[PDB]
Amino acid sequence: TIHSQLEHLQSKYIGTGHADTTKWEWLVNQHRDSYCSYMGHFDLLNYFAIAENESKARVRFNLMEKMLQPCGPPAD
Amino acid sequence: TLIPGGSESLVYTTLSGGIGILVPFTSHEDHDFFQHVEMHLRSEHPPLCGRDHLSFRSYYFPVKNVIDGDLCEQFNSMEPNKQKNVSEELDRTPPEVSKKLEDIRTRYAF
Amino acid sequence: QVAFPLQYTPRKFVIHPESNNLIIIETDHNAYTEATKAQRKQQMAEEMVEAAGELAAEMAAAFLNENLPESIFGAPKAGNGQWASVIRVMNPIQGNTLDLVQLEQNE
Amino acid sequence: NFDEENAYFEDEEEDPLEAFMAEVEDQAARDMKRLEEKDKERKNVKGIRDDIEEEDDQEAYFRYMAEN
Amino acid sequence: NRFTVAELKQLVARPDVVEMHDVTAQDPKLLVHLKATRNSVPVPRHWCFKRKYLQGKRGIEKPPFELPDFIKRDIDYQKLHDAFFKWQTKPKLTIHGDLYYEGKEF
Amino acid sequence: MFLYNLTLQRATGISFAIHGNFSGTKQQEIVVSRGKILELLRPDPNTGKVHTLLTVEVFGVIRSLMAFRLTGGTKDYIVVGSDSGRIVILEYQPSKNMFEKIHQETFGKSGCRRIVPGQFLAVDPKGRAVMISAIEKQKLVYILNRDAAARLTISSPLEAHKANTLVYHVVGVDVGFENPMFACLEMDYEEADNDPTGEAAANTQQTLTFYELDLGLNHVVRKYSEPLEEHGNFLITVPGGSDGPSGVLICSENYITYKNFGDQPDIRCPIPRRRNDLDDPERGMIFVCSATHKTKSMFFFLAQTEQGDIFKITLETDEDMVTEIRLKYFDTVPVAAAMCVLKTGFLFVASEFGNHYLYQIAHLGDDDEEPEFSSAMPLEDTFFFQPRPLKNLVLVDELDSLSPILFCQIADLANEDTPQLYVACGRGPRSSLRVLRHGLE
Amino acid sequence: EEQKERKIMKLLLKIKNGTPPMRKAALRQITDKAREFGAGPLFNQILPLLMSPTLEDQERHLLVKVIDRILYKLDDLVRPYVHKILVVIEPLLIDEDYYARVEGREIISNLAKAAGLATMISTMRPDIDNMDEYVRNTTARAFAVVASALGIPSLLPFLKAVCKSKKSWQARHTGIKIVQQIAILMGCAILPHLRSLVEIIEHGLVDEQQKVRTISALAIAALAEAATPYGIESFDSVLKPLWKGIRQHRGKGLAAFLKAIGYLIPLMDAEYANYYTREVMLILIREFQSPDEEMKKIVLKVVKQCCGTDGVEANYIKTEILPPFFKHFWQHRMALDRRNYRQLVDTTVELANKVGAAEIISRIVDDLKDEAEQYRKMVMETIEKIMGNLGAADIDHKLEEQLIDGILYAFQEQTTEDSVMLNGFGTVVNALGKRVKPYLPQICGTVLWRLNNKSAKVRQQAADLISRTAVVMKTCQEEKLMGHLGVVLYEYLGEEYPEVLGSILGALKAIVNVIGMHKMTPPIKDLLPRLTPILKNRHEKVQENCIDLVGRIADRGAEYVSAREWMRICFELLELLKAHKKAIRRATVNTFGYIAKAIGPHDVLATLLNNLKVQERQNRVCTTVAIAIVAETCSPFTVLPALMNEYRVPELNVQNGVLKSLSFLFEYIGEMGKDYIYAVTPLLEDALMDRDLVHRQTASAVVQHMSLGVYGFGCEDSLNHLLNYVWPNVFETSPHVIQAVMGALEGLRVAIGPCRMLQYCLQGLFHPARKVRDVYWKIYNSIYIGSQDALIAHYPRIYNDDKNTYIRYELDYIL
Amino acid sequence: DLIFCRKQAGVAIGRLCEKCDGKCVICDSYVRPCTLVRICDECNYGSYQGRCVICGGPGVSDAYYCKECTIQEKDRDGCPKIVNL
C-alpha cells in the first residue's frame, strides 16, 4: 500500500495534477508559484522594480494582490 | 585583459553591484587540484545557512565545467586543525595550498 | 570610483572611436519630460489662483519659483503609460555634458 | 519525588487568608450557580483548536481507502 | 459537439501535427499547441498498439555483443592502462529527442 | 573548456538589516543581508564611520532575518530563514571573528517554494518562541529555552497549517510574560476559485488573525480573527507589558490603524500628503518601512512613504486604552529598504538602490512650529504638509554602493595603460556614470 | 434513556481494542459528541477504566488524549466533578514511573484550563491543612501543576496569603512546599517572578517552627537551582538570615541552610563569592566531624559547588580546605560506604581540576598500597579520572616512581578481575608515554606473570592490557621481550573459552599492528596457517579479531604466504559478507580489499565470475559485492573488460548477473564512475532493446545508479542518449519494471535536470487517452514535488484566450 | 500495510536494531550512510522510546539515510518510521 500512500501524498502537495486537470488549474498554479518565486528571489524583484519604476515594497504588494485571482475567474 | 601583461578573462557584472570573472584552466593538473579542493571543502566547510553547495550552483541547470573559487578561498579562513585535515588529503601543507590559490588569482585579476 | 550624475535610468551607452566620447540613452517609466513638468506646474498654478477666494494672497508665485531637487525629494512618479527619455554626449575624463537631446513625452 | 536527600529531610517528624478564602468561595459559588442555570450563556468560543477540529493526514488517507 | 479533423486543421497555426485522435481530447486546442512547442519529443508511438512493445519479427536473431575497438586494441599493467585511455573514443550518441522504437535498428 | 570563478568586488545592495548587541558588550552592531552574503557592521560613536567587521558568503538566498535575546542574557542571537528547508540560529564570536552555528532545524525541501516556510519570520519579544511561515498554508513554531550552562535549546516544531490561505506579514505581539502571541495578515481564496462570475474574488477581505501558543498545554490555537476595512501591507509590533499597550499597527493604503484584542476600539489616521503634489491624483500612498525606538520613559515610531518622507508616530494612551494616533513630519531621505534607530542617537538608512547613509539624530524631542496631525482631528479632504530640507538629521557617513549595475564597458578611454571600468548604474534621478580604477587614491 | 448514551459511548472500547482508522474516527466523533453526552456519564465510566489495575502504557496514553478532547468539548460543565477527578488523579504525580507523572500532569493541566482558578482553589483548599503527610505532598504538586498551567501571577495572591497564615503551621509549610514544587517543575521559566516568590517565602527562615525554616531553606535552594546562572539581586534579603542560621543552627535545619548556601554561592561575584565562602567554609570544616551520612553528602556537595567558583582561589583551598578534607574523608570507612563513595570521587576530581593534580595525586597515591582492596579501587578510580582529565605533566620523579610502584602492587594484589585496575594501568601508562622506560621491563615482567596462568580470566585481562598499552610499549624503542610476549600469546591460540580467545587475538593484533613486520620474532608463515581455521569460529569477538588480524597481515606481510592460500582465504571470506553483525561485515570488506590489492585482480576476478555463474541467490549477491570491492580497490579499468566480455555469452541468467554486478558496481563507486560511462553505454543499449523483462529492469537500475553517481561532472550526453532508450518503457504494466523505470527517471531528474523531463512530459500531459494521461501526470507530479522552483524558468508560453489571461508579462520586460 | 508515518519530524533520533544496523530506512541500501534520521514525537514516547524504525525491535545504533536518498532530498519528508495498520 506504500505506492497508494505515495499517490495520496502527491495529491496532497499543492500544485500536482492528474488525468482530469484542466488548462485553467495548471495555469493558475504556475502563475501563483511564479509570483511566490518573484517574492523570494531578491534580484528578480530588483529587475521588475527597475523596469516599471516603482519601489520594491509596492511591487511586492502588487504581487500579493495579484495572488488572489490570477488568469481571471473560472469557466461556466 | 585586466592587468598589464596578464591573461584574458570573462568579466561579468551583476544587478546587486557585484563584479566577477571566469578564467580558463590551461593544464589538467591545476584543474584536478582545484576540483579536489572544491570536493573536500564542500563536505568539511558547508554553507552557513543550511544550503547544499552543489545543489545551489545547480539551481536551474546542473553545473558543467566550473569550479567555485569563492568556496575554495574559504580555505584561508578555516581553523588550523581543519586546514591541516584538508591539506593532508591533497598531499600538501596549508601554505602551499594558499600559494596555489593566490597564483591563479594574480595571473588574471588583482 | 568617480561618479557623474545623470537624469534618468541609463539603459545603454556606446563609445565614439575617434573622440572616445560616450553616447548614453536614459529612460524612465511613470515619468514626465521637462516640458510636461513645466506646463503641468503652470497649469496647477493658474488653477489654484482661480480657487474663487480673496485673489488677494498668492501662493502661486511662491510655488513656481524654486524646484525641490529630485535627487533628494524624488521625481514625481505620475502616470502608467508615461515615459521620459534623453540622449546624452559625455566626456569620460571630465564629467561635462557635451550635448543633450530631449525626446517627446511618451517616447 | 525520589532523592536520598528528600528521604533524609522527610524523616524527622513528631485573618487576611480567611478573608481571601471567603471572597474566593463567593465568586466560585456565583460561577457554579451561573453554569448550573445555563440561563445566560452565549457560548463565546474562546480559542479554536485547529488540530482537534481538523482530520490528520493519516485520517484522510484512511477515509480515501474506505471510499475506494 | 466535437471538432472534425479538417475543421481543427483550419484553426491551428500548424496543421501537420494534428492526428486522428486529436479531435477526441478534452482540450484539443491546448493539445495541438503543446504538440507544436519548439522542443518536447512526442509520445512513444506504441500506446495504441497491441503487441506489448516487443515486436516478434524483423529477425532480432543476431550477434550477442560487439565490444568496442578499445576493448581488444598480470593481465595488463599501467602501460596497457595508458593504451586503454589513449584509445578511448566517444561512441555514437543520439540527441535529446531521438526516441527508440521496435523497428529503428535495421 | 574548464572555468574557475572569482569574485573581484562583492555585492553592496542591502535587503534586510537588524541591530543589536551581537558581541555581548554594550556597543551596538548592525547585521545586514546582501542577496547571498551576510555582513556585520559597527558604526563608531566617536567619528560616525561605519566599519565592516565580518562578511561571509552563505551560498543561498536569505529571505528573513531576526534578532532575539533570552531573559537574563546580554548577547543577541541571529535567526535566519533561507531558501533551504532549514531554520538556522547563529552566534557571533568576537574573539574568533566568525559566525558560529548554534542550531539547525530541517522542515522541508529546498528552494523558494509556495508552501515551504522561510519567507516570513517572527519572534516573541521576550525570546521564548519563534515562528517561521510560508506565503501559503504552512506555519511552524519553535520554543526556545536554556539549560543550566546557559546554552540555547530548541524544541520540536508545532504546526499551525490552514489551507487556501495567503499570508502578507507576521509579527510577534508583546505581552507581559503571558502566553506568546503572533499576528498575521491573512486572506482566504477558496471562495474565489469556485465563482465563475468573478464576484467572490472581489468582496474578499483581509483578516487580522492572532495565534496563541500555550506553553502549559504545548499547542498553537487561533484565538481572534477580524476582517479589515481595506488591504494592508506590513504590521508593526507595539511595545507592551509594563511599557506601553499591547497591540499592532496596520499600515495600509492611505491609512494607518491601531488594533488590539479585547475592549479596545479601532483607531484610524490618514496619511498626510505633500501640498501642491505633482504626482498622478489616482495614485495612493503606502508606507515602505518602519523603525521603533523604545526608551525607559517613552516610545515612538519612524515610518517612511514611497516618496521618501519619514513621519514620527506617537501614541496617546490611557491606563490601558489608546485614544489617539498622532503623526508629525520628520524628514525626507531616499527610499529605504530598512531603517535602524541606534542608541547613542544614530539613524542608519539602507537604500533600495545607490549609496547608504548614516545620520546623526540632532534634535531630540520636538520643539517646533510645524503642525502635528491626529486621529482625533475631524476631516470630511486630507492633511497636507510642506517638504523641506533636513532639520532633525545631519549626514555623518555615506557608504558607496554600485547597485544596480545596468551597463558596463571595460576600456582604456584615458591614456593610462591599465583599462578602466565605465559603469552606468543607478535608477531614477539618483543614477550616475561611475569610473572604476584598480588601486588606492 | 440513560444507558442509551452509555451503549453509544462504548466508543472508548471502539478505540481501546480497535484499529487506528476507527480509533481516530471514534475520537473525532466522540469529540463532537462530548458536549451533548455530558461530563457526568463520560467521567463516571472513564475514570474507572483509567483506574483499571492492569491498563497498558499506550492504553493509558490514549485515555489521556480522550480526556483532553472531552475537556476541549466541555469547559465550564466540569466544575461539579473536579473534586472527584482529583481524588483519582492526585496520585500518578508521586508515581515512580516518569510517563505516569507526565500523563497525570497533562490531565491536571487540561482540567485546570477547562475549569477556573477559583474552582481549583476552592476544591484544593480543604486539604491544605490536612494532617496526613501523604495528602500535603500531592496537594503541593497539584498546585504547582495548576500554577504551571494558568500562570504564576494568577496564583501569587493565594500563595502570599497562605504562607502568612497564623492559623496553623501546616498551611505555611504547604505553601512553601508549593513554591518549591513550582520551582522544581518549571525550572528557568521562573526567572521573571523570582523576586516575587522570594519575598513571598523569605519570612519563613526566621519562624518559630523548625519544619517551616527547613522547608523555606529547601525552597530557597530550589529557586537558586532553577535560576542559575542568573539572579543574585533577587537573593539579597536572604543572605543575612541564612548565614546567621548556619552560625546558630545545628542538625537537619543546618543541613537545609547549608544546601541553600551551596546553591546560592555560584551566583555571586568574586568578592561576595570569596567573602561568603570563608564563612560557610569555617562552618563546613567544623561540620566535617559529623557522624550523620546525609550531612556528609550535603557537605561534599557544598564543597564541590563552592570550590568551583572564581571567588575562591587555589591558595586558600590548599591552605585551609585540603588538610581537614583529606584527614576526615579518606578512610576505608568511606570506601565501604557505597552511598557517598561516588560523591567523594567526584568532589576530589573537581578539587584537583582547580588546585592542581600533583597534591591530590600524592596525598592519595601513598595510599595505593593498602590492606583493604575497596580503598585501593577507590584511589585507583580517582587517580585515573584525574589523569584522564588533566594528564601527567606536573608529575615528577618521586611521584612517578610512587605511581608506578603503587599501580604495579595493586595489579598483582587482585582477587577478582575488575575493569578498575585495568583502566587505571592503561590510562597511567598512556599518560606517562615515552617517560616510562625501566618500568617497561617491570610492567612486562608483571604482565608475563599474569598471562602465564591462573584461569584465563586473568589472562584475558592481561591481554586487554597488552592490547591497550602496546603502542607506548613499542614507541619507547623496545622490541625483544615484546617478541617474548608475542611467542606466549601465539602458544595461547588453542582456547576453549571464546571470550579469552578474543582478547588473545586482540593482543596479538595490537602487537603485530604496532611493531614492524621487520625484525620481529614470531614468523608470519607460522601464524597465518595456524590462524586460518579460526575464521570458521562462530563467536562474534573471535571472528572480528581474527578477520582484523588477517587483514593486517595481508596489508603489511603479504609477501610471506603463497597466492593460492590467499585465494582460499578470500573464497572463505566470501561467506562472511552475509553476517548479521555490522562489525563482521566491515572487517570482512576491509580484509577482502587488502587481499585483492595484494594478489591482483585478474585471478580473483576470474574466480568470482565463475562463482557468480554457479550458486544460489545469496552467494551470487555476495559475489556481486565482492566484484564491486575488487573494482574499487584495483581501479575499475581492470574489472570492466572482463565483466563486459561475460555479457557476450549467448545465454540468459549469465547476462542478468553481469547487469546486477554493473548496477552494484556503479552504486558502490559513485563519483569514480565518471570515466567509465562511455564504455558501458552500448551494453546498456543492447540490454534495453531486449525482450526479457529482467534485462530492462536491471538496465534501468544501472541507469539510476550511474545518474546519481555522476552529478556535476558533465556527463549529460550519454545520460540523454540512455534516456532516449529508457523512456519507451513508461507504458509497462509489470510492477517491478515500472518501479525501476520510475527510479531511473528520478535519478535522471537530478543528473540531467528538470527542464529535459518537462520537455519529455509536455506532449503527453493532455493526451486523449486516459492511460497516457495517468502515466504522464504521475511522472510530472514526481518532477514537480522535487525542484518546484526551477520549473518556473522552464514552462512554455501559453497564449491568452478570450476569457482568461495566461501570458506572464513580467518576464517579458526588457531593461 | 508497510506505510511510512510521514508526520512532522522532531528532535528525536531514529534507532536501528542489531539486524537492521547498516540499512537505509527508505531504500534498504547498505552503501554510504549520510544523514541522521529524525522521528516525530508520537513515535518516540513511553514504550516506543528506543525502537528500530524498520522493524520495531530494541534499538542499538543510529538510523541513517543513504547518500543516494540525501541527494534526492528524500530526507525532507515526514517521519520515516514504518507503521502497520
Ligand SMILES: CC[C@H](O)[C@@H](C)[C@H]1O[C@@H]1C[C@@](C)(O)/C=C/C=C(\C)[C@H]1OC(=O)C[C@H](O)CC[C@@](C)(O)[C@@H](OC(=O)N2CCN(C3CCCCCC3)CC2)/C=C/[C@@H]1C
Ligand atoms: C545489492 C547488494 C546487496 O544489497 C547487499 C549489499 C546486501 O543484501 C546483502 C545483505 C547483507 C547484510 O549481507 C549485506 C552486506 C553488506 C555489505 C556488503 C556492505 O558492507 C557493510 O555493510 C559494512 C559496513 O556497514 C560499512 C562499510 C562500507 C562503508 O564500506 C559500506 O560501503 C560504503 O559505504 N562504501 C561505498 C563507497 N566507497 C567509496 C570509497 C572511497 C571513500 C569511501 C566512500 C566512497 C566506500 C565504501 C559497505 C558496503 C557493503 C555493500
Ligand SMILES: [Zn+2]
Ligand atoms: Zn536510501
Ligand SMILES: [Zn+2]
Ligand atoms: Zn530491525
Ligand SMILES: [Zn+2]
Ligand atoms: Zn512518525
